[PDB]
């Protein structure tokens, strides 16, 4: 494909060289497949052993790991190496140059298009849109009326932005996405459902991800937050009113209740739901499949679940806790007369 | 942006007046950041503080409440504040009767497509399909051959109806929303997997809301239906042949496994499993993340999980948990001697 | 509609025919709805009682119960009436004949695409792919650059393919599911999150069925993989770099997290999560919502979670689950002197 130096490498991430700085280079790769024309990097030393065998022609190291790599020539020296590998993703990520308007596109009259953004075929650009500088619309998607998209944006196919919802710059939203849908509203009379309609929008900061076949509701009165450095994976329901602080990450399906705000540098592991109305401090990790019901004010660590059981095992263990509440647990813990 | 006299608006409730009926108002509003020029409503005495000091130039209450509000001089008096609340956002709804067939849409020359429907761009719709009066069919549609939607229905962009489902009247689905996809029939031999076909349909209701991103599969033989005023949320899977009794709401996230009945007026809350060939009667609520294995052969509210935990407790709890199966429980409760 | 002869039916299944081998037949149907021209199946005793009510034209069945159906004349003997029905599907599954490429397609030359493909509406196929012939592109889809789809595959509308995604033959996606959208990988550096791009891809088996709403993200630097056989329902989570196994079966809304491994022959029932970085092995059975945090090493049925309670009841379980750490558990019931 296309080659970098590795001193060019080693500069671009800040790093000191050892080794023969003009050595060609054309991917990064695992530790494993690596070749002589890959750059690879040493994680902490649980990984020296697989370092010590690898095909690799120069490692990401950490300078306490390249003394413990005297097998190898070519390094390059930071005090974050998964960083450093971070970083370098993007120099040989291969890159979207691409610009202008497909023709097939429908933008509406009165939108305002960057010279330098990119929409796809069967785009539909509403009233009042605006998109920003460099940023890139795949094909299929729909921008409704009053939506606006900022600078270095990524919205890929069949994303749905909707509600009027505000896109600060470098959001990236992934396909079959739906931003600002019309959240989950009803009320009960005669026992049947009336809909209410929702009248908000959403808010969305700089530098947030937002993965594939997510539900990102519009407010039922006021708006959706989503903080500046918020990432969201896949399958994830955000419900109307949620507002989730800075550089929060919620794990693949995920549920957050309508109107609950999550506090900043929280972290949500796989599944776990979370009830409407509550509210979730700042530095709250939950693990995976937790049922959050109550507020949790204080930061640290949060779960639930039975954990994994052999299935008889759990079977018997499932009948003993359906016992539980027969039995009068600390009132014998200190019984001895 | 249309304004509206607050005599009106208590009319359009059935709501005795209060105040000065000539008062203008553009939108509905939250307590919290509700201006003059809006209108809001109190839902019981615990939202009284928020209210007080509110800006919003009228109130939607009970009679028991304006007693509470004396700071306040524009009411609208009802029995039931959320249902005229529920009314009034569909007034302040963008209203679009947009009509006719976009000329990008392709439409097989057998199909019905009454005059007051509206087709969106991208629509593709096959063989004896019908679109009954007043319904709209967002852009990037598809419907499958022998599919019918009823009259005043709502249908999103990138939704697939298929296997010729039969949609009623009033009936609203989201966007990336699958209707009548092939169901998970698969049977065993020789240690792999046998493709079973999946010949039947999707019957759903009149006053039928379904979410975005949400899987709803045909039968197997017979039809998956959902009755009546069935309601559901974002993300849920429907499986072949499930079938929903009328006004039963289903949150986010749940799935119900083929075959499965659940009965009229049922409530599941987030993220349920329902596993598959089961009754739930009428009247069932479930809380979040509930899992159901058996029948629920009586009304009632029921429940699964472990509440949430701090990680340490977490860990310490479920090392006991294990332990459980070996602890005779019944034998020492009467054991006193 | 279109007819079929008992005889060339009980032909197709290598099955021995009894009664008038020429009567005609419209479809398959069930026991319960079945009428004269409709063929169904005897699955075992326990529905025997239903048969014997049955209107159905005729009863594929095996020797031991034809023996207890004296009041039916037409037949179908097989050994597993079950996978003769599965086969016997297929011939009454409507054939979607369709060859060529639609007008409305955008497919760039230096992608080859078989004569005896269909490229449907609004397809957009992008550069240096390969679609191999007797598949079928349903309407809307987008292939990105330089993916791969074989022989006999079906991909149905709004599904992304990305990420340099490679299929084998008789691949079928069902719709809006996402194929090798970038992982969720982010590096974590001053209470931010760092994008790291991703740089693997996808290879897909023969004979691979992905539900619809499902997310199969690219590999970080190798590939994600889902051997031959592998089935997955309807909103499934498979993370950057899972690896399935062959005839594994992942049931609706299962999260598999990232470098996890998943042996052969597996079946996780639905909307179980898997945590990153583990192996499970070999022929493991899952149940309902199993949460799997280590490594499962050996075959066998694994489960996690509580029963289903009713609610007050479930109330004091967990309050008493809450008092369990507090107790010491194992040291009295050896506590007799």
């Given at each position: 494909?296309?080659?970098?130096?590795?001193?060019?490498?080693?500069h671009?991430?800040?790093?000191?060289?050892?080794?023969?700085?003009?050595?060609?280079?054309?991917?990064?790769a695992?530790?494993?497949?690596?070749?002589?024309?890959?750059?690879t990097?040493?994680?902490?030393?649980?990984?020296?052993?697989?370092?010590?065998?690898?095909?690799?022609?120069?490692?990401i190291?950490?300078?306490?790991?390249?003394?413990?790599?005297?097998?190898?020539?070519?390094?390059?020296?930071?005090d974050?190496?998964?960083?450093?590998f971070?970083?370098?993703?993007?120099?040989f990520?291969?890159?979207?140059?691409?610009?202008?308007?497909?023709?097939?596109?429908?933008?509406?009259?009165?939108?305002?298009?960057?010279?330098?953004?990119?929409?796809?075929?069967?785009?539909?650009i509403?009233?009042?849109?605006?998109?920003?500088?460099?940023?890139?619309?795949?094909?299929?998607?729909?921008?409704?009326?009053?939506?606006?998209?900022?600078?270095?944006?990524?919205?890929?196919?069949?994303?749905?932005?909707?509600?009027?919802?505000?896109?600060?710059?470098?959001?990236?939203?992934?396909?079959?996405?739906?931003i600002?849908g019309?959240?989950?509203?009803?009320?009960?009379?005669?026992?049947?459902?009336?809909?209410?309609?929702?009248?908000?929008?959403?808010?969305?900061?700089?530098?947030?991800?937002?993965?594939?076949?997510?539900?990102?509701?519009?407010?039922?009165?006021?708006?959706?937050?989503?903080?500046?450095?918020?990432?969201?994976?896949?399958?994830?329901?955000?419900?109307?009113?949620?507002?989730?602080?800075?550089?929060?990450?919620?794990?693949?399906?995920?549920?957050?209740?309508?109107?609950?705000?999550?506090?900043?540098?929280?972290?949500?592991?796989?599944?776990?739901?979370?009830?409407?109305?509550?509210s979730?401090?700042?530095?709250?990790?939950?693990?995976?499949?937790?049922?959050?019901?109550?507020?949790?004010?204080?930061?640290?660590?949060?779960?639930?679940?039975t954990?994994?059981?052999?299935?008889?095992?759990?079977?018997?263990?499932?009948?003993?806790?359906?016992?539980?509440?027969?039995?009068?647990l600390?009132?014998?813990?200190?019984?001895?007369?």
């Amino acid at each position: 494909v296309q080659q970098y130096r590795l001193d060019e490498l080693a500069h671009l991430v800040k790093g000191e060289l050892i080794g023969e700085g003009s050595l060609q280079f054309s991917n990064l790769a695992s530790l494993e497949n690596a070749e002589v024309n890959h750059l690879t990097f040493v994680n902490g030393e649980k990984h020296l052993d697989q370092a010590k065998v690898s095909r690799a022609g120069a490692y990401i190291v950490t300078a306490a790991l390249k003394e413990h790599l005297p097998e190898k020539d070519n390094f390059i020296i930071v005090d974050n190496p998964y960083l450093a590998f971070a970083i370098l993703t993007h120099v040989f990520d291969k890159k979207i140059s691409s610009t202008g308007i497909e023709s097939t596109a429908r933008i509406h009259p009165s939108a305002v298009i960057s010279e330098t953004a990119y929409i796809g075929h069967y785009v539909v650009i509403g009233e009042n849109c605006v998109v920003g500088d460099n940023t890139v619309i795949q094909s299929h998607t729909k921008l409704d009326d009053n939506v606006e998209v900022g600078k270095d944006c990524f919205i890929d196919s069949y994303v749905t932005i909707t509600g009027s919802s505000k896109l600060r710059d470098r959001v990236r939203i992934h396909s079959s996405t739906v931003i600002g849908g019309e959240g989950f509203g009803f009320a009960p009379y005669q026992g049947k459902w009336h809909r209410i309609a929702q009248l908000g929008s959403v808010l969305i900061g700089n530098d947030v991800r937002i993965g594939s076949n997510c539900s990102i509701d519009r407010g039922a009165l006021d708006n959706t937050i989503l903080e500046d450095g918020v990432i969201i994976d896949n399958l994830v329901q955000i419900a109307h009113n949620v507002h989730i602080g800075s550089n929060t990450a919620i794990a693949a399906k995920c549920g957050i209740a309508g109107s609950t705000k999550i506090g900043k540098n929280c972290i949500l592991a796989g599944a776990c739901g979370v009830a409407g109305h509550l509210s979730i401090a700042d530095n709250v990790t939950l693990t995976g499949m937790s049922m959050v019901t109550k507020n949790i004010s204080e930061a640290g660590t949060y779960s639930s679940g039975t954990g994994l059981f052999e299935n008889n095992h759990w079977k018997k263990t499932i009948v003993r806790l359906r016992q539980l509440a027969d039995v009068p647990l600390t009132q014998i813990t200190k019984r001895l007369d």
